[PDB]
């Protein structure tokens, strides 16, 4: 009866079902957990918001077209405006979180295409000016739930001031490595003939027990079309990709007034 | 060494000291506590924000003058815009809280005056029109940290629309009972010759285990000058009264999008 | 509904409500649907980004035809009233495309689902009363 | 031949019944019967369905 294709995930007041899964990945074989006393750093009693924040948040959907080059998000950036998770994140200097990432993309038995879904620790990307190095604005690095897109062309700006964004070049994974090697990162593939969803469970990953969520993204989420969307009756068809992410084992330290980041 | 006059209270990252206290009141002899499984109602796993929210918040100070008739606040209304307590309150349908109320008023050995400090369950007050009954706007009932003032005169409005506020008449406690009987409510007195602070620890009080904090104030806080401020060198002198309140054993149910109440 | 008709013989209700959805498109139709319950006191959700902050389930359409969303018992009062009443308001149930429904060619591009409601085992009613759903001329 | 039974609790507790009539039809209401088996209406299926398992395997 039980199947690698059929899964239920419940966190807080939220449940996901899938009937065409392909198992689930636990990044580096490690389930998320709370911070042990023997690895702790800040000494204030932490906030552990539990079900208020540790629940599935669904981002705005994106459209997969035959011409799409791919999509990226950063975490916890993508969830910074999500209910009580966002409030706990911005009221505290420090936060840590694992995640359940659920990527959703259904089609038909007559569609074809394959998405690589990669969870990348410290997903540092190239800037878009050759007048400077490491020259990216906070606003362009932290787009929130809209994330960003890859391009198949690199056109760095004439003026340094116009190039303060990522050069998200697909085949170099936006960071000077070949995209074919992205499989060293925790991943699944959504191959439309096989599966309609990817599930990645991510532990907290950092060189520290806990860090400034508003300064630092622990994970990149990359969705690359490895094989282009094709549908014989309409080559210009679009199918949605929906990203749903639950924080897990969230813990916050250093309560004060709320952080309100710059928007320009 | 230990004295009824000298007290330290620590909640979360916040500490109060007083060197001229008069013991402390525990309303109805009951310390606040979390909601037991055998008295529970909503079935979702509650949020218990602990140190993020269960900490001392200091309101704007008010000025005690020889002509002051008194001050009122409602709880949890007075704390609705206070850090993570306010966020937890408005992100949830349901909340319960106890409080430590610390009222602060120092003067000199040459000043005189006495404040009655009363914690009143279900502090329902009279409206200011005789064209209607029970005719108070949400905005006037819920002033937040600024609270309101008592008057020694009742001047109900000509037009029903102009009288949608409390008739906070001091000697009738704004509710048709004699102020001299307010001592049946949990209270202390700040008598300037004796003490410079009042401390009241309040359990959650309601006919329910948990309720809608945005709809319903569980407690009124009333400060009445029982004996007027007097200072021989300057009868027009003013001394501050500062109100500092810590939520305690806070518990929230029914997470959703944030409540944003009407402001007009 | 059968539940609604029974509730209209009672004044008070308590407990969790079960909403079960049956997708009746073709086998070739795929999709993900968000089903949400938002407890009351905030802006009623009209967008997926507000709905997903409440209690919700992401339903993947597939071989298992049906998905159950719960409105868990989340109330100030121990009972709600079996009338329209601000004090005992229950909140908001909404539904959005999580991705979209996708079909191949030669397949209907519009289709239906059926929504069912039932009470959970935590559910009870009290204070018997006459219903407003039957009457006669005199 | 008095029957002593538990009352339904109120705000804050036995009661006594004697039957006066030779016909059971004369008796007061039947005692509370909390019997129920919703599954005969909610799950009248031949083959057991385990909630955690797929409904259709």
């Amino acid at each position: 009866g039980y199947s690698d294709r059929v899964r239920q995930i419940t966190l807080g007041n939220s449940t996901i079902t899938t009937q065409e899964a392909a198992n689930a990945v636990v990044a580096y074989g490690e389930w998320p957990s709370y911070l042990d006393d023997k690895e702790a750093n800040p000494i204030d009693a932490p906030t552990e918001p539990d079900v208020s924040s540790n629940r599935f948040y669904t981002l705005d959907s994106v459209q997969w077209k035959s011409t799409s080059r791919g999509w990226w998000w950063k975490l916890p950036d993508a969830l910074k405006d999500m209910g009580m998770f966002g409030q706990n994140m911005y009221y505290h200097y420090l936060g840590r979180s694992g995640y359940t990432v659920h990527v959703q993309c259904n089609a038909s038995k007559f569609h074809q295409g394959a998405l690589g879904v990669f969870a990348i620790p410290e997903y540092v990307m190239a800037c878009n000016t050759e007048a400077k190095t490491s020259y990216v604005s906070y606003v362009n690095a932290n787009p929130g739930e809209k994330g960003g897109v890859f391009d198949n062309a690199y056109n760095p700006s004439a003026e340094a001031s116009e190039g303060r964004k990522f050069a998200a070049l697909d085949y170099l994974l936006g960071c000077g490595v070949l995209a074919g090697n992205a499989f060293v990162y925790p991943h699944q593939i959504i191959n439309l003939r096989t599966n309609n969803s990817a599930t990645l469970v991510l532990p907290y990953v950092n060189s520290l027990a806990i860090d400034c969520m508003a300064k630092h993204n622990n994970w990149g989420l990359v969705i690359l079309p490895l094989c282009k969307l094709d549908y014989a009756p309409n080559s210009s068809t679009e199918i949605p990709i929906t990203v749903t992410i639950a924080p897990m084992f969230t813990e916050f330290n250093g309560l004060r007034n709320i952080t309100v980041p710059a928007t320009q | 060494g230990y004295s009824d006059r000298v007290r330290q209270i620590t909640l979360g990252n916040s500490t109060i000291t007083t060197q001229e206290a008069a013991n402390a009141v525990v309303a109805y002899g009951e310390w606040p506590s979390y909601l037991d499984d055998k008295e529970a109602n909503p079935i979702d796993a509650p949020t218990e924000p602990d140190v993020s929210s269960n900490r001392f918040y200091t309101l704007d100070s008010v000025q005690w003058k020889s002509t002051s008739r008194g001050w009122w606040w409602k709880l949890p209304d007075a704390l609705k815009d206070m850090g993570m307590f306010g966020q937890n309150m408005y992100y949830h349908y349901l909340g319960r809280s106890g409080y430590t109320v610390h009222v602060q008023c120092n003067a000199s050995k040459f000043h005189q005056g006495a404040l009655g400090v009363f914690a009143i369950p279900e502090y329902v007050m009279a409206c200011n029109t005789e064209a209607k009954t029970s005719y108070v706007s949400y905005v006037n009932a819920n002033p937040g940290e600024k609270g309101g003032v008592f008057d020694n005169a009742y001047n109900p409005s000509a037009e029903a629309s102009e009288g949608r506020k409390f008739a906070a008449l001091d000697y009738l406690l704004g509710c048709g009972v004699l102020a001299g009987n307010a001592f049946v409510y949990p209270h202390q007195i700040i008598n300037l010759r004796t003490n410079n602070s009042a401390t009241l620890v309040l359990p959650y009080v309601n006919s329910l285990a948990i309720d809608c904090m945005a709809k319903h104030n569980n407690w009124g806080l009333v400060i009445l000058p029982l004996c007027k401020l007097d200072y021989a060198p300057n009868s027009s002198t003013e001394i501050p009264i500062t109100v500092t309140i810590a939520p305690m054993f806070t518990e929230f149910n029914g997470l959703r999008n944030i409540t944003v109440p009407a402001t007009q | 509904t059968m539940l609604g008709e029974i509730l209209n013989y009672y004044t008070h209700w308590t407990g969790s409500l079960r909403f079960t959805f049956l997708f009746c498109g073709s086998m070739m139709a795929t999709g993900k649907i968000l089903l949400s319950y938002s407890p009351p006191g905030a802006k009623p959700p009209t967008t997926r980004k507000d709905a997903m902050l409440g209690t919700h389930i992401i339903w993947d359409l597939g071989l298992q035809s049906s998905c159950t969303m719960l409105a868990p018992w989340i109330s100030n009062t121990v009972y709600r009233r079996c009338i329209k009443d601000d004090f005992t308001e229950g909140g908001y149930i909404t539904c959005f495309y999580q991705t979209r429904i996708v079909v191949p060619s030669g397949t209907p591009t519009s289709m239906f689902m059926l929504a069912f409601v039932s009470a959970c085992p935590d559910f009870s009613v009290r204070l018997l009363r006459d219903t407003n759903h039957i009457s006669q001329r005199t | 031949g008095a029957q002593v039974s538990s009352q339904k609790v109120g705000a804050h507790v036995n009661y006594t019944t004697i039957n006066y009539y030779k016909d059971s039809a004369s008796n007061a209401a039947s005692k509370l019967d909390f019997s129920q088996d919703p599954s005969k209406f909610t799950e009248p299926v031949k083959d057991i369905m385990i909630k955690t398992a797929p409904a259709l395997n």
């Binding site: 059929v6 239920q8 | - | 998905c67 | 797929p54 259709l56």
Partner: peptide
């Protein structure tokens, strides 16, 4: 005899999927 109590439960990440069913069965 009382209506059902609610047990303490946390989250899941599982091949157990009680949220999905098939009401075609008559259940």
């Amino acid at each position: 005899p009382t209506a059902q109590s609610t047990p303490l439960t946390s989250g899941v990440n599982s091949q157990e999927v009680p949220a999905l069913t098939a009401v075609e069965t008559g259940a």
